[PDB]
Design a protein around this motif. Structure first.
Motif, PDB file in Angstrom:
ATOM      1  N   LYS A  21       5.735   5.551   8.508  1.00  0.00           N
ATOM      2  CA  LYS A  21       4.450   5.017   8.946  1.00  0.00           C
ATOM      3  C   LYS A  21       4.126   3.685   8.280  1.00  0.00           C
ATOM      4  O   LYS A  21       3.430   2.854   8.872  1.00  0.00           O
ATOM      5  CB  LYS A  21       3.340   6.029   8.661  1.00  0.00           C
ATOM      6  CG  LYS A  21       3.616   7.421   9.207  1.00  0.00           C
ATOM      7  CD  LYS A  21       2.505   8.392   8.847  1.00  0.00           C
ATOM      8  CE  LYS A  21       1.241   8.107   9.639  1.00  0.00           C
ATOM      9  NZ  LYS A  21       1.397   8.458  11.076  1.00  0.00           N
TER      10      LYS A  21
ATOM     11  N   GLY B  77      -2.920  -0.739   5.735  1.00  0.00           N
ATOM     12  CA  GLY B  77      -3.892  -1.333   4.837  1.00  0.00           C
ATOM     13  C   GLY B  77      -5.169  -0.540   4.672  1.00  0.00           C
ATOM     14  O   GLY B  77      -5.882  -0.735   3.681  1.00  0.00           O
ATOM     15  N   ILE B  78      -5.480   0.343   5.619  1.00  0.00           N
ATOM     16  CA  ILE B  78      -6.715   1.116   5.566  1.00  0.00           C
ATOM     17  C   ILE B  78      -6.428   2.562   5.175  1.00  0.00           C
ATOM     18  O   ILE B  78      -6.881   3.030   4.125  1.00  0.00           O
ATOM     19  CB  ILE B  78      -7.472   1.015   6.908  1.00  0.00           C
ATOM     20  CG1 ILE B  78      -8.727   1.892   6.897  1.00  0.00           C
ATOM     21  CG2 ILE B  78      -6.552   1.265   8.113  1.00  0.00           C
ATOM     22  CD1 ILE B  78      -9.640   1.644   8.073  1.00  0.00           C
ATOM     23  N   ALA B  79      -5.675   3.279   6.011  1.00  0.00           N
ATOM     24  CA  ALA B  79      -5.277   4.650   5.696  1.00  0.00           C
ATOM     25  C   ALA B  79      -4.036   4.955   6.532  1.00  0.00           C
ATOM     26  O   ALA B  79      -4.149   5.241   7.725  1.00  0.00           O
ATOM     27  CB  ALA B  79      -6.400   5.632   5.981  1.00  0.00           C
TER      28      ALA B  79
ATOM     29  N   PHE C 161      -1.450   6.989   5.057  1.00  0.00           N
ATOM     30  CA  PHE C 161      -0.845   8.159   4.439  1.00  0.00           C
ATOM     31  C   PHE C 161      -1.338   9.473   5.030  1.00  0.00           C
ATOM     32  O   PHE C 161      -0.865  10.535   4.615  1.00  0.00           O
ATOM     33  CB  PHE C 161      -1.104   8.144   2.930  1.00  0.00           C
ATOM     34  CG  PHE C 161      -2.556   8.249   2.565  1.00  0.00           C
ATOM     35  CD1 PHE C 161      -3.374   7.134   2.598  1.00  0.00           C
ATOM     36  CD2 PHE C 161      -3.104   9.465   2.191  1.00  0.00           C
ATOM     37  CE1 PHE C 161      -4.708   7.227   2.264  1.00  0.00           C
ATOM     38  CE2 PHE C 161      -4.439   9.563   1.855  1.00  0.00           C
ATOM     39  CZ  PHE C 161      -5.241   8.444   1.893  1.00  0.00           C
ATOM     40  N   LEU C 162      -2.265   9.434   5.978  1.00  0.00           N
ATOM     41  CA  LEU C 162      -2.820  10.660   6.535  1.00  0.00           C
ATOM     42  C   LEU C 162      -1.926  11.170   7.657  1.00  0.00           C
ATOM     43  O   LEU C 162      -1.775  10.484   8.673  1.00  0.00           O
ATOM     44  CB  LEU C 162      -4.228  10.417   7.054  1.00  0.00           C
ATOM     45  CG  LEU C 162      -5.265  10.075   5.986  1.00  0.00           C
ATOM     46  CD1 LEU C 162      -6.531   9.535   6.623  1.00  0.00           C
ATOM     47  CD2 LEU C 162      -5.565  11.290   5.129  1.00  0.00           C
ATOM     48  N   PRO C 163      -1.327  12.349   7.523  1.00  0.00           N
ATOM     49  CA  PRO C 163      -0.464  12.867   8.588  1.00  0.00           C
ATOM     50  C   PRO C 163      -1.264  13.301   9.806  1.00  0.00           C
ATOM     51  O   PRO C 163      -2.465  13.569   9.739  1.00  0.00           O
ATOM     52  CB  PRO C 163       0.236  14.059   7.927  1.00  0.00           C
ATOM     53  CG  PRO C 163      -0.693  14.482   6.848  1.00  0.00           C
ATOM     54  CD  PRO C 163      -1.353  13.235   6.347  1.00  0.00           C
ATOM     55  N   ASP C 164      -0.568  13.367  10.938  1.00  0.00           N
ATOM     56  CA  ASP C 164      -1.191  13.718  12.206  1.00  0.00           C
ATOM     57  C   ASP C 164      -1.289  15.234  12.362  1.00  0.00           C
ATOM     58  O   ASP C 164      -0.691  16.009  11.612  1.00  0.00           O
ATOM     59  CB  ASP C 164      -0.410  13.113  13.368  1.00  0.00           C
ATOM     60  CG  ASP C 164      -0.119  11.644  13.166  1.00  0.00           C
ATOM     61  OD1 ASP C 164      -1.052  10.901  12.799  1.00  0.00           O
ATOM     62  OD2 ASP C 164       1.041  11.232  13.370  1.00  0.00           O
ATOM     63  N   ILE C 165      -2.053  15.653  13.373  1.00  0.00           N
ATOM     64  CA  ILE C 165      -2.408  17.063  13.511  1.00  0.00           C
ATOM     65  C   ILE C 165      -1.190  17.907  13.873  1.00  0.00           C
ATOM     66  O   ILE C 165      -0.988  18.994  13.320  1.00  0.00           O
ATOM     67  CB  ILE C 165      -3.536  17.223  14.544  1.00  0.00           C
ATOM     68  CG1 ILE C 165      -4.550  16.089  14.390  1.00  0.00           C
ATOM     69  CG2 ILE C 165      -4.216  18.569  14.378  1.00  0.00           C
ATOM     70  CD1 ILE C 165      -5.740  16.204  15.313  1.00  0.00           C
TER      71      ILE C 165
ATOM     72  N   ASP D   7       1.014  13.191  -6.625  1.00  0.00           N
ATOM     73  CA  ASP D   7       0.982  11.755  -6.838  1.00  0.00           C
ATOM     74  C   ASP D   7       1.547  11.408  -8.215  1.00  0.00           C
ATOM     75  O   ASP D   7       1.518  12.231  -9.133  1.00  0.00           O
ATOM     76  CB  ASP D   7      -0.448  11.232  -6.722  1.00  0.00           C
ATOM     77  CG  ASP D   7      -0.905  11.092  -5.283  1.00  0.00           C
ATOM     78  OD1 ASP D   7      -0.176  10.467  -4.484  1.00  0.00           O
ATOM     79  OD2 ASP D   7      -1.995  11.602  -4.952  1.00  0.00           O
TER      80      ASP D   7
ATOM     81  N   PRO E   9      -1.350   7.607 -12.506  1.00  0.00           N
ATOM     82  CA  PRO E   9      -2.023   6.379 -12.072  1.00  0.00           C
ATOM     83  C   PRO E   9      -1.702   5.209 -12.986  1.00  0.00           C
ATOM     84  O   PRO E   9      -1.494   5.368 -14.191  1.00  0.00           O
ATOM     85  CB  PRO E   9      -3.508   6.749 -12.132  1.00  0.00           C
ATOM     86  CG  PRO E   9      -3.572   7.846 -13.134  1.00  0.00           C
ATOM     87  CD  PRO E   9      -2.309   8.631 -12.949  1.00  0.00           C
ATOM     88  N   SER E  10      -1.659   4.018 -12.390  1.00  0.00           N
ATOM     89  CA  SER E  10      -1.310   2.819 -13.146  1.00  0.00           C
ATOM     90  C   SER E  10      -2.381   2.473 -14.171  1.00  0.00           C
ATOM     91  O   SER E  10      -2.066   2.000 -15.269  1.00  0.00           O
ATOM     92  CB  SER E  10      -1.090   1.647 -12.192  1.00  0.00           C
ATOM     93  OG  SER E  10      -2.286   1.325 -11.507  1.00  0.00           O
TER      94      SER E  10
END
Ligand SMILES: [Zn+2]
Ligand SMILES: [Zn+2]
Lengths: 472, 250, 364, 95
Positions: free
Chosen positions: C30, C37-39, C41-45, C311, C314-315
């Protein structure tokens, strides 16, 4: 066993939102503002098959302990009083030992039931609930004069206190309203008197709280303020005249006849000047549409939103609809538009991002704070006590809310499109009937939520939240 | 081929009245047909808004342009080209089945027959819409047509799934459409009384516990499941979440 | 040494499996083609709809490739019309809505009779596991009376590979994408020969789990370990487990140190301890793998089990370790490294307790 | 001879009116309303345009048509809800 992930535990952990009641409109009857205190303690003290229930024995023991603490604190014990004050903070705080989320959910559910019961009890007599909350309740009074509601209000509060389930509540009356224009918690204007005195005419002061004013162009906000003042004056004048004379109410009917022609002439003049000086470079400063967190509408002509807001504020009458509609059509005729056009439809110029169960350490005050609609210099300080808040706490709470949101989206259920029955099998292409699966939580909703997190984090200085975004 | 458009008695379908006295056709005539579509009218105001939009657009002042674009973007073809295509496909190809499709059809037919029997033994009147071997021939011919559409000389699972989906739509819309037609109701009111008393608003309980309790009592499983799912169908006090395990009282 | 790569679960390439073509299919990522740039990483249904389908398809292919099986299993839905006949079938094992034991297949589902079951010992028969069931159907009820039960057998790497030749799954030499499919076996033997030499010089050492960087005893033991280690720096060093003994979450009190600030502080001291082991910091790369109750998970899981594709650290809380050391990589809880001729995977969680608490019970 | 043409008509006004008539109707009363009444509104507007020997429909004719249709629907109800519906539908036929 508590180390394992279970669905019902997950849903009772994140069930933190609290409902509220808002009934917009313009009221000519007097309205009193009251505050409710010691709600949780009264809720606790008053009142096999179900697996989610909390243990009854522990609940009874805790109720008895709280009752003895109340009795001891009544007999001049400061320590017991402090313990009673800190009980709620202990209940909410997970850092305390012997903490069970089931007990917290039980307390929250009981508080919900008690609040709805109290609203019903207030509705038993002649009353209309305008606004509801854990801290504030607004009640519409049948009468017309604040001076006549003294014994009425005292009798009502006395009867409320004498109720066995409301024995321990603390009720205080703050303000009396003469004429109110209520549409939202953060957007209202009206005439108020602090407290009714005797043998003297009360002191009346005008309030004007309108976040919608901020989203206007810099040069039209004075016009909005002036015309709001004028229309409030006109409504006050017509109500006074009607009262002097003695679902429609002649208290307000016919109030727009006072300021029609001057308003139309002023709108024409504004339109002419805007047409003349919109493309000038040195005049481009005052026509700049401000940007604020939660703003999503993209629109061009400022005078259109000015008149749209100035008409939507009047339309809240719910009893003088036709006159307002005629005035609105006449105003829209100045432009080359039509009565039911899409561009002539008013919307909310801002979104909402609310954080529930926000706690203050110094005052033990519990309230839900809105990160978008609320004005500045109120996010950073508690309402009752004027103590500054910690900022990394705000960032952490926002991050926790976002992560819980993402988890809730990811653990959602599946529903069939045609018949709303739920999916009951692990692998299957579609419903036995016609229709394709759809998610209970739509994607665009969470996308918009993340957008507003981005806007909020950009507006103020919020660096760890920005890092939280970046890792995605 | 026979295509027929008919109206039920009393105009509107009148779901409150039983399907048996809503359709005057005999069992023999309906069996010859094999796709029966009950076109009900609904009011939700969003489909109504969309339909008003489409009608005012299809008004001759607008659509005469828009439909032209469907012949310019290649989204839709002209009528006479479709006529030539259908005559060519009718003359040219005639597909055939595959053994896996045969097994799937056999199992699906057995399933629908069992479902019809289970509905009939409950309602205790004969179904107004029958299911017979002619319907199996119907599904076979639907699959054959689906394969014929693409000129493939054989029919496979891709067409079989679509055929079964269409048949299930056209049979669940009509035959199994509320087969009960609305112990009697006495146990229903007794059932609703106890869960209201025993289970308050806001909590939830397991399905197995409720079934165990009300099978131990006189309610038993057949009465409770229908009662539970109709209380769900009331859709004002009880909600399902987390598969069929959680019974949430809103 | 070069020509080795470490990859996380975030950047692993997507490959679907098709049951009608019996072949793996590349799936575009993806991020590469989308905006992201917005979202992004959200998988589809439909992904959760097809996940179990993909797992079942892979297991079916693996089972049917077995030498012994050339008897044949029967899909569940084909069991309606027969009775008093033995069969064989496999699928998901779970509990139905009612609360009985059931087997689920893309065709359908049945019930299970367990009263006379003799299972193959040596397996943790757990709900959610593919199982092979041999029994007798009975149409009087809907009970598939089971008499034997065994998990499917497994296969070695070479035999499964050759079915796709040598596909470029963990592609370091070359990769496949939407346009083309790529394969390679020529340099495999060359890299095997290369690895056969100087392998003792390229050692990698791992530590234990849950090294809490808050207590003094762990710090002292770690200092002694680094004292012994600094003389001979290895090639890779791995630290696994949580780095804080208490999950970090919302702090309701501002009087004391914020838990996030404490978590930041704990890693800062580690940078100071790195200052006296310069040879290790200079010659050995460093790997950190998140534990069960680290920053992001414990924020919503509060120390309990949560999402598995965890995840990375975090940096914002690791702004000094990256500057002191020269080679530090943070990856997900499941992480895959690609050596010259070796595939190594690391996975940190609790297994024995999970499989002990959820073992299925067999009357006997 | 005269054939009216229909270009500048309010999309949202007519759409909302039809949605409102779809509401109430059988859902609260008895009278049936279908899509054919929308075409009836359009035809009545066209007829009113024909009355003046004009080739293009104006807004006034649309107002007259919508007034006629809503009045015909209103005055065919029970006396218990007639006044309530009459005050409810006063915004489309404002004039
Ligand atoms: Zn405070
Ligand atoms: Zn469905």
């Amino acid at each position: 066993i508590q180390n394992d992930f279970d669905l019902n535990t997950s849903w009772i952990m994140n069930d933190s939102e609290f409902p509220k009641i808002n009934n917009s409109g313009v009221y000519d009857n007097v309205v009193l503002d009251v505050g409710v205190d010691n709600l949780t303690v009264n809720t606790i003290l008053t009142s096999e098959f179900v697996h989610d229930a909390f243990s009854n024995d522990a609940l009874n023991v805790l109720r008895g302990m709280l009752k003895e603490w109340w009795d001891e604190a009544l007999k001049e014990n400061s320590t017991a009083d402090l313990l009673v004050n800190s009980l709620a903070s202990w209940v909410q705080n997970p850092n305390a030992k012997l903490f069970d989320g089931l007990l917290r959910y039980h307390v929250h559910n009981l508080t919900k039931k008690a609040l709805l019961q109290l609203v019903n009890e207030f509705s038993a007599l002649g009353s209309t609930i305008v606004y509801a909350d854990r801290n504030q309740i607004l009640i519409k009074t049948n009468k017309y004069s604040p001076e006549n509601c003294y014994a009425y209000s005292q009798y009502m509060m006395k009867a409320v206190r004498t109720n066995p389930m409301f024995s321990y509540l603390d009720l205080n009356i703050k303000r009396y309203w003469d004429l109110l224009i209520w549409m939202d918690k953060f957007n209202f204007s009206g005439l108020a008197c602090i407290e009714i005195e005797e043998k003297e005419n009360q002191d009346y002061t005008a309030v004007s709280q309108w976040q919608l004013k901020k989203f206007l162009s810099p040069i039209y906000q004075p016009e909005f303020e002036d015309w709001m003042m004028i229309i409030l004056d006109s409504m006050l004048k017509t109500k006074q005249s009607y009262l002097k004379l003695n679902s429609v109410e002649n208290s307000l009917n016919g109030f727009s006849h006072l300021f029609s022609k001057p308003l139309m002439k002023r709108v024409k003049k504004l339109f002419k000047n805007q047409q003349e000086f919109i493309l000038d470079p040195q005049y481009e400063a005052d026509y700049v549409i401000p940007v604020l967190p939660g703003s999503h509408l993209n629109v061009k002509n400022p005078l259109l939103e000015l008149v749209k807001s100035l008409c939507h504020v009047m339309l809240l009458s719910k009893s003088t609809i036709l006159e307002i509609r005629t005035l609105r059509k006449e105003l829209l005729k100045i432009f080359e538009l039509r009565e039911f056009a899409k561009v002539a439809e008013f919307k909310d110029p801002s979104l909402s991002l609310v954080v529930p169960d926000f706690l203050c350490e110094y005052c033990f005050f519990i309230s839900d704070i809105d990160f978008c609609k609320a004005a500045p210099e109120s996010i950073f300080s508690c309402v009752r006590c004027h103590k500054a808040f910690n900022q990394v706490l705000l960032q952490e709470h926002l991050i926790q809310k976002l992560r819980s949101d993402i988890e809730s989206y990811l653990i959602q259920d599946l529903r069939c499109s045609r018949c709303h029955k739920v999916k009951r099998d692990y692998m299957s292409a579609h419903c036995p009937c016609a229709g394709a699966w759809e998610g209970t939580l739509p994607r665009e909703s969470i996308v918009q939520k993340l957008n507003v997190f981005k806007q909020v984090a950009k507006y103020y200085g919020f660096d760890i939240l920005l890092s939280c975004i970046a890792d995605l | 081929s026979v295509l027929a458009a008919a109206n039920p008695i009393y105009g509107r379908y009148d779901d409150l009245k039983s399907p048996g006295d809503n359709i005057d056709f005999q069992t023999t005539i309906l069996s010859r047909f094999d796709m029966i579509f009950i076109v009900k009218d609904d009011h939700n105001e969003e489909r109504d808004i969309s339909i008003a939009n489409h009608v005012i657009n299809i008004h001759t002042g607008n659509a005469n342009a828009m439909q032209n674009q469907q012949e310019e973007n290649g989204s839709e073809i002209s009528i006479e080209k479709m006529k030539r295509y259908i005559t060519y496909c009718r003359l040219k190809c005639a597909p055939r089945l595959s053994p896996q499709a045969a097994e799937k059809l056999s199992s699906n037919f057995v399933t629908i027959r069992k479902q019809l029997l289970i509905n009939e033994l409950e309602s205790t009147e004969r179904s107004s819409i029958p299911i017979t071997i002619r319907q199996l021939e119907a599904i076979i011919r639907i699959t054959e047509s689906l394969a014929k559409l693409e000129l493939s000389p054989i029919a496979q699972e891709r067409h079989v799934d679509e055929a079964i989906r269409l048949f299930q739509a056209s049979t669940m819309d009509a035959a199994s459409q509320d087969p009960i037609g609305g112990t009697s109701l006495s146990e229903i009111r007794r059932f609703e009384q106890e869960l209201k008393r025993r289970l308050p608003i806001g909590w939830s309980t397991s399905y197995q516990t409720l079934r165990r309790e009300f099978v131990d009592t006189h309610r038993f499983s057949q009465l409770a499941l229908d009662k539970a799912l109709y209380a769900l169908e009331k859709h004002e006090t009880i909600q399902l979440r987390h598969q069929g395990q959680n019974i949430y009282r809103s | 040494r070069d020509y080795f790569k470490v990859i996380n679960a975030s950047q692993q390439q997507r490959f679907s499996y098709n049951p009608h073509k019996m072949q793996f299919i590349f799936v575009p990522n993806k991020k590469q083609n989308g905006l992201g740039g917005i979202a992004g990483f959200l998988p589809d249904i439909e992904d959760k709809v097809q996940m179990f389908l993909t797992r079942y398809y892979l297991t079916n292919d693996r089972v049917m490739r077995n030498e012994n099986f050339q008897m044949s299993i029967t899909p569940i839905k084909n069991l309606l019309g027969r009775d008093a006949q033995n069969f064989l079938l496999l699928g998901l094992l779970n509990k139905n809505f009612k609360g009985n034991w059931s087997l689920e297949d893309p065709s359908g589902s049945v019930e299970i009779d367990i009263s006379q079951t003799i299972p193959t010992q040596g397996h943790y028969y757990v709900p959610g596991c593919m199982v092979l069931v041999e029994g007798i159907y009975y149409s009087v009820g809907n009970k598939f009376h089971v008499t034997s039960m065994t998990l499917p057998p497994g296969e070695r790497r070479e035999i499964t590979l050759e079915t796709i030749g040598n596909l470029d799954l963990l592609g370091i030499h070359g990769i496949s994408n939407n346009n083309f499919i790529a394969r390679l076996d020529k340099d495999l033997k060359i890299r095997l020969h290369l690895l056969e030499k100087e392998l003792t010089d390229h050692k990698f050492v791992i530590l234990g789990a849950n090294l809490f960087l808050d207590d003094l005893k762990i710090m002292t033991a770690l200092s002694k370990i680094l004292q012994k280690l600094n003389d001979d720096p290895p090639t890779l060093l791995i630290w696994q487990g949580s780095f804080t003994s208490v999950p970090v979450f919302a702090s309701m009190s501002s009087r004391n140190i914020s838990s996030s600030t404490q978590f930041k502080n704990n890693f800062d001291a580690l940078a100071t301890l790195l200052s006296r082991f310069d040879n290790l910091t200079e010659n050995t790369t460093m790997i950190f793998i998140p534990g069960p109750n680290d920053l992001w998970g414990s924020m919503v899981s509060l120390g309990a089990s949560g999402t598995l594709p965890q995840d990375p650290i975090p940096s914002a809380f690791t702004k000094k370790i990256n500057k002191v050391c020269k080679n530090v990589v943070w990856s997900s809880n499941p992480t895959r490294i690609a050596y010259l001729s070796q595939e190594i995977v690391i996975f940190r969680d609790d297994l024995s307790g999970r499989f002990k608490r959820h073992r299925l019970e067999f009357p006997f | 001879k005269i054939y009216p043409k229909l270009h500048q008509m309010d999309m949202d006004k007519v759409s909302r009116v039809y949605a409102d008539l779809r509401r109430e109707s059988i859902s609260t009363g008895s009278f049936p309303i279908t899509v054919r009444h929308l075409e009836s509104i359009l035809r009545i507007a066209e007829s009113f345009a024909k009355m003046r020997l004009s080739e293009f429909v104006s807004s006034y004719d649309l107002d007259r048509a919508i007034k006629v249709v809503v009045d015909s629907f209103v005055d065919a109800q029970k006396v218990s809800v007639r006044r309530q519906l009459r005050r409810s539908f006063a915004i489309y036929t404002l004039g």
